Amino acid sequence: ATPVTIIGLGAMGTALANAFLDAGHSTTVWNRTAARATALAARAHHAETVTEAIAASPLVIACVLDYDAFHETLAPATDALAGRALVNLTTGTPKQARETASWAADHRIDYLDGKIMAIPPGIATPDSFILYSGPLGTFEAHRSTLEVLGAANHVGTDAGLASLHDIALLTGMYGMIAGILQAFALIDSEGIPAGDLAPMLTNWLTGAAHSVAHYAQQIDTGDYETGVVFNLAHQSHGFAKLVQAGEDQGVDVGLLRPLFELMRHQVAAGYGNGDVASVIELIRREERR
Amino acid sequence: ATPVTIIGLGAMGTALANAFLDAGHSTTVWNRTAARATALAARGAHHAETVTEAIAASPLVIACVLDYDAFHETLAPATDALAGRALVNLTTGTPKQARETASWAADHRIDYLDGKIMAIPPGIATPDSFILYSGPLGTFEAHRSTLEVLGAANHVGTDAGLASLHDIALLTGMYGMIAGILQAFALIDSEGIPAGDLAPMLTNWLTGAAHSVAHYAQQIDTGDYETGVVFNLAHQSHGFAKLVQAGEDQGVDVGLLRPLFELMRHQVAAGYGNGDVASVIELIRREERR
Numbered sequence: 161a162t163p164v165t166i167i168g169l170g171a172m173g174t175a176l177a178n179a180f181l182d183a184g185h186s187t188t189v190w191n192r193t194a195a196r197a198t199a200l201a202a203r204a205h206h207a208e209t210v211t212e213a214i215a216a217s218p219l220v221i222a223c224v225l226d227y228d229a230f231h232e233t234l235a236p237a238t239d240a241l242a243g244r245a246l247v248n249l250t251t252g253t254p255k256q257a258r259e260t261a262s263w264a265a266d267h268r269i270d271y272l273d274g275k276i277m278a279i280p281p282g283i284a285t286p287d288s289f290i291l292y293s294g295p296l297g298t299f300e301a302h303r304s305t306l307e308v309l310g311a312a313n314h315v316g317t318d319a320g321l322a323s324l325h326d327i328a329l330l331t332g333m334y335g336m337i338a339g340i341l342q343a344f345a346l347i348d349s350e351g352i353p354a355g356d357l358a359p360m361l362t363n364w365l366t367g368a369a370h371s372v373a374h375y376a377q378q379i380d381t382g383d384y385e386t387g388v389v390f391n392l393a394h395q396s397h398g399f400a401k402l403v404q405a406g407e408d409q410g411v412d413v414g415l416l417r418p419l420f421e422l423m424r425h426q427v428a429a430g431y432g433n434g435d436v437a438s439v440i441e442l443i444r445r446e447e448r449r
Numbered sequence: 450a451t452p453v454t455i456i457g458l459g460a461m462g463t464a465l466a467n468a469f470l471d472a473g474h475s476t477t478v479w480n481r482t483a484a485r486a487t488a489l490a491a492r493g494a495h496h497a498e499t500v501t502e503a504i505a506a507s508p509l510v511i512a513c514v515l516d517y518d519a520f521h522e523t524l525a526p527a528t529d530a531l532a533g534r535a536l537v538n539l540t541t542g543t544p545k546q547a548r549e550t551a552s553w554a555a556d557h558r559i560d561y562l563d564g565k566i567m568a569i570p571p572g573i574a575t576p577d578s579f580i581l582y583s584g585p586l587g588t589f590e591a592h593r594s595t596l597e598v599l600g601a602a603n604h605v606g607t608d609a610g611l612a613s614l615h616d617i618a619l620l621t622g623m624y625g626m627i628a629g630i631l632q633a634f635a636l637i638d639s640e641g642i643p644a645g646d647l648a649p650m651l652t653n654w655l656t657g658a659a660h661s662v663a664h665y666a667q668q669i670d671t672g673d674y675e676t677g678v679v680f681n682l683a684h685q686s687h688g689f690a691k692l693v694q695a696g697e698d699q700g701v702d703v704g705l706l707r708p709l710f711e712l713m714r715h716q717v718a719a720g721y722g723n724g725d726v727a728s729v730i731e732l733i734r735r736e737e738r739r
């Protein structure tokens with residue numbers, strides 16, 4: 161029954177507000193532009209300033225463009241934030257997440273840094289989950305409430321950890337996106353619709369997604385050799401056909417050159433009998449090699 | 450059961466020979482290094498000393514060597530030996546290689562078929578295995594049921610280069626995913642988190658991601674990058690920027706993602722910022738298709 165307050169009513173903010181009203185939470189809303197709050201008020205208290213939105217709820221959820229937008233909005237109202245739960249679901253770096261979290265510990269604000277792994281329509285469906293990092297007490301207080309938005313997964317007390325997980329998950333997805341676009345550009349070079357390849361490509365990538373754990377185990381033991389089916393020397397040999405075909409077809413293949421480069425270096429450095437995961441030794445933190 | 454000849458008995462070629470043996474075909478084998486032929490002879494394969502004897506044994510010949518150069522170096526002397534036969538080439542190569550091979554074949558009365566294995570040797574003749582074929586439909590039709598010993602058989606068109614094109618497209622999707630996986634682990638590793646600690650979440654995330662493929666295919670084929678946009682490209686470009694800043698904050702190389710990032714920024718600068726990331730295809734697709 162927890163009253164909640166939403167700061168920022170963009171596409172993501174609007175979905176959060178709407179999901180709470182559905183679950184029956186006394187919802188207060190606020191936005192830098194009053195228009196966006198209008199439909200919400202029809203179905204929610206539209207507070208006229210940041211402090212009114214803040215003061216109405218023990219839980220304050222902020223969700224604006226970037227962190228610079230996060231300061232200017234809420235930095236004047238620290239004292240109104242004192243003794244409240246402030247959940248900041250704004251995209252940014254781990255460094256930003258930890259700076260903001262110590263700032264929030266100075267002014268007695270129970271800070272939680274969160275990152276939505278969902279698209280606005282997906283809120284309040286089993287497809288949404290949000291990662292939170294920061295004090296386990298703050299999080300555990302509002303969990304059932306936050307479970308309105310979707311799954312709530314606390315990933316650590318280090319405040320930047322949700323941000324790190326978020327960036328890691330998006331780098332995963334973006335890598336796949338570049339693969340997909342490159343695959344489509346290749347098949348497009350002979351006039352085939354993307355739609356003709358989509359079902360096969362979806363199945364292929366779904367199976368490929370099961371090697372994640374394979375790579376993890378290789379990275380965690382440092383053994384890139386045990387259980388390799390098609391080794392790196394062979395992958396690098398064949399990968400070169402992917403690049404030469406691409407330019408035979410008039411298709412740019414620069415999206416794949418960086419990984420290819422790393423693979424070829426690890427082959428030349430002696431890792432050709434192991435798996436492609438050994439590439440990680442060229443891009444991980446130096447201290448961890 | 451049609452007799453079959455396997456030319457090339459490395460890991461994959463040995464798997465094909467074993468599948469045909471297990472299915473009861475009379476299987477003749479040949480490898481540049483005799484040792485690998487001797488291993489299959491132990492199982493009942495007919496070990497042929499030369500490529501011509503092996504080819505002469507069978508109406509259907511399946512080559513599976515390292516690359517199209519080995520294929521050419523091996524089968525060109527035996528060109529005449531191959532007249533009147535079906536030749537199925539499962540070697541990885543480019544569409545240009547498949548098409549030039551299919552021209553050489555059709556010039557010398559060789560029934561040619563170019564195929565590509567989407568499987569690893571353990572997967573052959575299991576339900577996970579499929580092979581794409583392209584080239585003359587007649588060859589594919591006469592020998593399809595034999596080829597199904599190896600796994601599913603999908604003829605993807607008469608342009609002999611099309612199996613190779615399909616194979617490369619799929620490997621390209623997979624390797625971009627691999628680049629993303631390794632980048633994600635390198636980032637999570639920067640705080641000493643075990644890769645295995647992220648792997649379940651990463652796997653579930655990317656299996657969900659994989660079902661976005663149809664969406665991007667819809668945007669590419671309709672040429673409409675703007676309808677169906679939740680989070681536009683100009684915002685993604687913003688987010689991507691922080692994603693790269695975090696990597697250097699954490700001491701992790703983020704070079705795997707810079708080429709995509711550059712295409713994204715170029716598209717925002719050209720005025721596509723209200724569309725989706727799929728519009729990046731305009732910058733890499735063949736000029737005639739833009």
Ligand SMILES: NC(=O)c1ccc[n+]([C@@H]2O[C@H](COP(=O)([O-])OP(=O)(O)OC[C@H]3O[C@@H](n4cnc5c(N)ncnc54)[C@H](OP(=O)(O)O)[C@@H]3O)[C@@H](O)[C@H]2O)c1
Pocket residue numbers: 168169170171172173191192193194223224225226228229230232233249250251252275276277278279280679680684688
């Ligand atoms: N949308 C998604 O798919 C999605 C998914 C996961 C995470 N996120 C994250 O959630 C956050 C919200 O993004 P969104 O897509 O909802 O972005 P959006 O549609 O741009 O909304 C951003 C919010 O930022 C406010 N804003 C922008 N500049 C501001 C400033 N300079 N000072 C104060 N407020 C400002 C806006 O209010 P005005 O409109 O009044 O300017 C707006 O309500 C982002 O960090 C995004 O990365 C979004």
Ligand SMILES: NC(=O)c1ccc[n+]([C@@H]2O[C@H](COP(=O)([O-])OP(=O)(O)OC[C@H]3O[C@@H](n4cnc5c(N)ncnc54)[C@H](OP(=O)(O)O)[C@@H]3O)[C@@H](O)[C@H]2O)c1
Pocket residue numbers: 389390394398456457458459460461462463480481482485513514515516518519520522523539540541542566567568569570
């Ligand atoms: N997971 C897989 O293994 C897999 C999956 C899909 C596709 N493929 C494709 O299948 C093909 C074969 O791969 P593989 O894993 O079986 O590779 P492999 O185990 O390295 O065996 C390569 C084969 O090529 C032969 N070869 C190499 N150079 C040659 C030459 N110059 N003249 C004649 N024969 C030559 C080898 O003979 P020697 O024994 O005398 O070296 C051997 O028979 C590759 O193009 C690969 O891309 C493999």
